[PDB]
Amino acid sequence: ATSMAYLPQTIVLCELRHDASEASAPLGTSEIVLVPKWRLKERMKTGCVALVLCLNITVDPPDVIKISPCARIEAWIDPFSMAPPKALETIGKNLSTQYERWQPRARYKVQLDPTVDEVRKLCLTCRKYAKTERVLFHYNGHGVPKPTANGEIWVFNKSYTQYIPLPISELDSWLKTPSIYVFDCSAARMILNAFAELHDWGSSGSSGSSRDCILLAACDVHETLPQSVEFPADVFTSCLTTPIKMALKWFCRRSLLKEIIDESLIDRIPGRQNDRKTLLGELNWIFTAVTDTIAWNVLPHELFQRLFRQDLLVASLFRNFLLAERIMRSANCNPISHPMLPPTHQHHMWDAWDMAAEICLSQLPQLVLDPSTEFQPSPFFTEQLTAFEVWLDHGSEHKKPPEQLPIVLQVLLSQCHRFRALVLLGRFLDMGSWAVDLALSVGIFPYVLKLLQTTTNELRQILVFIWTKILALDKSCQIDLVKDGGHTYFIRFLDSSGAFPEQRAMAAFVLAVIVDGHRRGQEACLEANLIGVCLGHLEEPLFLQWLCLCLGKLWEDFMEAQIMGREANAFEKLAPLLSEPQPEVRAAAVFALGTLLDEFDDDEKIRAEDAIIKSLLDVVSDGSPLVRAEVAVALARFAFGHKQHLKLAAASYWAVYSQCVRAMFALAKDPSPRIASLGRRVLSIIGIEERSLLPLSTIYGWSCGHFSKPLSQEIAAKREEKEKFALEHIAKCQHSSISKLNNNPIANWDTRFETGTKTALLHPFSPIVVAADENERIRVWNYEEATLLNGFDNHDFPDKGISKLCLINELDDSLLLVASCDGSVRIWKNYATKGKQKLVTGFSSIQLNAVVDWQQQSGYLYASGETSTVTLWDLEKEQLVRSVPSESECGVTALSASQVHGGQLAAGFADGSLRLYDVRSPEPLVCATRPHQKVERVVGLSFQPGLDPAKVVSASQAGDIQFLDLRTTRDTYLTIDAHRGSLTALAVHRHAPIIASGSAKQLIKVFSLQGEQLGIIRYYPSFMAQKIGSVSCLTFHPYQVLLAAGAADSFVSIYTHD
């Protein structure tokens, strides 16, 4: 109902630019610099391949064999179907054609049943071809004996009478640093166990590595390859080189029991490996996706990046190796790689492959009956995208990565489910920096970089979002976006057939990052008319912010863009933003105007640069430190050019340059100490006390924080908690018949203010006093616990003077305003903590004996003093909304804003006069009256407790409190003569009908609103100076009948009414 007038919802100074404990980020400090770990530059190439084939045909080595069925198919050929020399040719050809499909642009060399010297040359030659590039050595010892414990491969002599051993040391001497080996022989570990012992131990911090020597062995030390006819001899090679063919042929014999499904249809599968819209290519695609996923969840960032991203062939071999892991296992063989890798067999994900290969192979019978192209695409991708969704909703933390992530990647490659994958990816990127780091670890970057070439307007809104998130984390993608012409993508999105300025802010932000200190990005965006595009929209606050930050970064340190800025009238379109309500907008405008910069002469630029610096000097005295900081950096920039002019101006002070010097010295004494040190930097650049000395802007770096971040119920609980206490105790104050004062004080607290207490303030919702010295020290005393809670120095400047203490946002987390006699205002968070009290904002109100009052309702701060005007500040905007002429011709001594009626204000004057204002009116002065007729200053005043514009007001120093309501009559309601002269303080309650006055004799008289003397208190001195003559602090508790009083001695005493 009506008492909602007492209880405002206007919160103020609780935005992200006023941030609290962990971050002093909110300007001043530079942005958080990044150090990435996803940087393997070298796309590595396996440029040469050496195939070696030791299979003496129908000459089994004397190691085991025995089996009557025994397997001997190789490269999918029966070697007993062509006679030795042509069989061994065909196997050599097929096997290279097999490998060649994985790396078609390497060079391939085959050698069949070779001598040691032939192999010496093979390997020596493969070095010379691919110098830095990797070499692949494939060895097949099926017709020779098993590798040794001495570390040996077996090869032949010319006449084939002997098996000649070939030391691993010699192979490793012929091939060198970048190389990879495949061994499809029996006891193959044996080779790797030799390799590990070749070189001295050291040169790494992994298991037992050093070089770039990669090894793929077919089975263990004690193991022999399978002889069963269900497998070939070629199992490991066939897994690594023909994975699909093997995976299905295996799936037939094992799982389904083979006899329903003709196994030779696997040779005749329709389509090619390329076409994802054919049954072969799509099955190949599912396999890639399945296997790539098993690797990513099983392996760590680094090892995954080395084996599965770096080298296209190594990627494929180690991918296909995970199939060997599984198949070989079923045939009593346990293959190993040198970078060892954890167990991957029977990972959940092989189940999803098995499902899809069963759904494929049942379809295969009918597709041969006729090429019908009734090829039903597999649900697999849809199914896994849904499992990623499930993860994103339920379990949306860092509770171990999503697993479906490398499948989301594969889906981006075809249009089939691209939009939803991109949607789910963005949704995933949105959860934070950690999730971007994960996306870029999978290898999403270049695929999402390619999609900036897609014209499809469906994808554009999601692609901007994805790129925002990436560039919010990693600024360095700058280089790659410009080199591929991705910058044009976002400029078109700024022109926009589409709508939504939240999306266009992103687009402006993305371009700001692309450009930021990137002279090729500046140049590329300048050629695309980004100035013109941006300036077009300058004819929502976030969008205006980023339109400026984009232009700012584009101008910066680039005379060609600056010239385009002037002649496109950037100044004339930017300047009106300098007076926008949001400090974020103003500060950004200042940054942009700032980066356009860099006797009697006029050319084009001097007009612009004079007009720019004039407009920036106009916002020197701004309410928000955010803006002032930017103005100070832009002044430093301007100062850097015109040092000679500005030195001569500093001589005479101690046309436009004289204004500049005032602004430096004004900034040098600013109430925000970071702004103050900024101004002191500018002074030292001028030489009042190499481009590296210039201070650097922060608005851009702060604002980026928005995007590097996702895109309540306790807050409202403690809000309503206090509202209950307020409304209940309001009624109590009013309706309780307030009996006499209890003269026995509850406290007589020694502040140790040597000079004494000058003001104080009671807290509404807790047992706290705040008191202040004449030199603006602040103590936060507790009157229920009898304990100190904090100690300050409000500012470190030598010229002191306390003027006022107020509470802003009483209803949720109070901030302590501390106004000073020079007009500066400082508002403090966490003032009740032991010593963790940050300065939220400081601005100089009044541009003296300043007098200040805060109107929580309207968000207005009123300030004035020995000035002709009452200055009006709007702390939601942090602007000087209005300068109201007092129309007095003497000083404002006291100043009370109405807590009920926003805009309305009472003002006590030095001559004893008294004025109402309605600051929300074309004529602000409502009425002007004397009351109390001695010509002495109005030491205090206030609006009468209630919902009317009446006024307890006008305690004059002459001694007389005068009551008057200015609706009906000028003359006084009621006079009370508290003191014979020397009235030094007044205290008027917010709700209870009660007042108290203070005397510069010794004395405190409490009165009813009607006039009854409810109490007298005499503040007695402690030694005999007889100086209790600044009984200055007198203040009632907002919601309780509790007085607080302090003098020109040292004791802040509290009293109550029984």
């Binding site: 296209l312 490659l413 695929y447 390619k450 999609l451 070439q453």
Partner: peptide
């Protein structure tokens, strides 16, 4: 020169 083939 991408690892997996894209269809733009």
């Amino acid at each position: 020169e991408s690892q997996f083939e894209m269809d733009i």
